[PDB]
Design a protein around this ligand. Structure first.
Ligand SMILES: C#Cc1c(F)ccc2cc(O)cc(-c3ncc4c(N5C[C@H]6CC[C@@H](C5)N6)nc(OC[C@@]56CCCN5C[C@H](F)C6)nc4c3F)c12
Ligand SMILES: Nc1nc2c(ncn2[C@@H]2O[C@H](COP(=O)(O)OP(=O)(O)CP(=O)(O)O)[C@@H](O)[C@H]2O)c(=O)[nH]1
Ligand SMILES: [Mg+2]
Length: 169
């Protein structure tokens, strides 16, 4: 069975774990341990292909050991998550993309930009700003809410499709 290694990255509090748990368990809860980093799996059918998604939900201290580089390098695609109510989380996207390009040693890594917490009224990052950034990176942009489930399947399935496009090259 086909398997895809997906990694969910971004600033604290943006909703990486809530997104992951929506994908796997189809629900939202008010609280998630902010400290837990681990991998999870879901079996999915995307465009008729059955596959296993192994999802690394990142967390924990900001450290750059060689071991951490090597683990990140096994990721085949990355969700770059920010929250639409947190400008700093959007500003930090650049850094996460640089670290991915560094460990993958490539300017062509499958990535999707994800603007999470789309249900909240307290927007500080404009949709247009995010679209322009994703266009500049050459990657898709998906608006999500882990709370309502808006966009969640689309974000993960779009990342799988980006991985397939890379595999065709
Ligand atoms: C992820 C990943 C990541 C990759 F995708 C790819 C390759 C990587 C190779 C690494 O060896 C290591 C990583 C990696 N591991 C953890 C990070 C992290 N933490 C602290 C918090 C926020 C998320 C979670 C984990 N808990 N924080 C920031 O950056 C935070 C900011 C704010 C304070 C200063 N820095 C610089 C920028 F300004 C942004 N980067 C991180 C990072 F790159 C990598
Ligand atoms: N309204 C709303 N709340 C969200 C959404 N996604 C996550 N949350 C909430 O935001 C907070 C952070 O959620 P969490 O999933 O732990 O984020 P994280 O990015 O995993 C935090 P860490 O970086 O420490 O692992 C929680 O209170 C969570 O329920 C969303 O789409 N909408
Ligand atoms: Mg988390």
């Amino acid at each position: 069975m086909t398997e895809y290694k997906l990694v969910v990255v971004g600033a604290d509090g943006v909703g990486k774990s809530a997104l992951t748990i929506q994908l796997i368990q189809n629900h939202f809860v008010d609280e998630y341990d902010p400290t837990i980093e681990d991998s999870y799996r879901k079996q999915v059918v995307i465009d008729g292909e059955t596959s296993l998604l192994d999802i690394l939900d990142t967390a924990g201290q900001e450290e750059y050991s060689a071991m951490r580089d090597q683990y990140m390098r096994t990721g085949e695609g990355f969700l770059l998550v920010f929250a639409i109510n947190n400008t700093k989380s959007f500003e930090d996207i650049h850094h996460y993309r640089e670290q991915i390009k560094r460990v993958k040693d490539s300017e062509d890594v499958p990535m999707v930009l994800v603007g999470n917490k789309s249900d909240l009224p307290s927007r500080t990052v404009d949709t247009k700003q995010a679209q322009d950034l994703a266009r500049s990176y050459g990657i898709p942009f998906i608006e999500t809410s882990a709370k309502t489930r808006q966009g969640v399947d689309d974000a993960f399935y779009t990342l799988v499709r980006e991985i397939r496009k890379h595999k065709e090259k």
